[PDB]
């Protein structure tokens with residue numbers, strides 16, 4: 087199918103981080119304010135007052151080679167819902183921008199009220215907090231515009247160390263692509279992605295392996 091992308095990092099607990107969202111073995115892991123994995127899936131999101139659960143820093147993209155990367159995204163898929171997309175993995179083939187022709191496999195770990203139809207909001211530290219700002223409470227805040235985040239690669243140099251790799255990826259593998267278009271199909275989640283979130287759908291084994 088065809089989709090549109092944006093970029094984000096708001097530090098909030100991901101929506102597929104709650105139990106009862108989808109038919110999975112366990113929800114996506116959340117972390118404490120110091121980027122360390124916690125196991126209380128009922129823990130209050132850090133984007134809410136008195137919350138303690140934030141997005142883990144390892145739920146960020148990385149390059150496997152110059153034409154292939156792995157990562158995560160907040161999704162809104164037409165005709166579906168959180169029960170259908172939480173923890174599902176999708177292979178995106180970019181169709182526009184400087185990354186046209188490259189592919190990336192992402193695991194869907196959340197969604198947003200502002201997402202349109204077939205809209206993938208890629209997890210990218212420095213890509214913009216958007217509606218909620220959980221990074222201020224978590225560690226003091228991230229630089230950049232509310233929507234769109236930072237604009238230069240050297241601005242990644244002052245990020246908390248755990249968020250640096252994801253920040254640099256944006257300018258390195260991704261070439262600072264500005265909301266590139268893509269084609270997508272559902273795939274079985276690579277073991278590398280489930281190792282970071284802990285979350286695998288019961289129906290994962292029905293889709294093609296990458």
Ligand SMILES: OC[C@H]1O[C@@H](O[C@H]2[C@H](O)[C@@H](O)[C@H](O[C@H]3[C@H](O)[C@@H](O)[C@H](O)O[C@@H]3CO)O[C@@H]2CO)[C@H](O)[C@@H](O)[C@@H]1O
Pocket residue numbers: 096098099100101104130131133134196197198199217218
């Ligand atoms: O039902 C479980 C718990 O839900 C809590 O609300 C969360 C929503 O379930 C979840 O959809 C939403 O997700 C946010 C996400 O954190 C944010 O990063 C993204 O930009 O937007 C999403 C959609 O708004 O988070 C909320 C808040 O944590 C209830 O608060 C809780 O009582 C309930 O048990």
Ligand SMILES: OC[C@H]1O[C@@H](O[C@H]2[C@H](O)[C@@H](O)[C@H](O[C@H]3[C@H](O)[C@@H](O)[C@H](O)O[C@@H]3CO)O[C@@H]2CO)[C@H](O)[C@@H](O)[C@@H]1O
Pocket residue numbers: 091092093094095096198200201207213214215216217232233234235264265
């Ligand atoms: O709301 C969804 C997510 O949006 C992310 O910001 C995007 C803006 O929503 C999107 O409108 C903006 O698009 C720009 C584009 O980058 C710019 O070059 C063009 O000239 O103008 C467009 C319209 O303003 O792009 C950003 C970045 O993807 C938020 O960063 C994210 O938190 C939020 O969930």
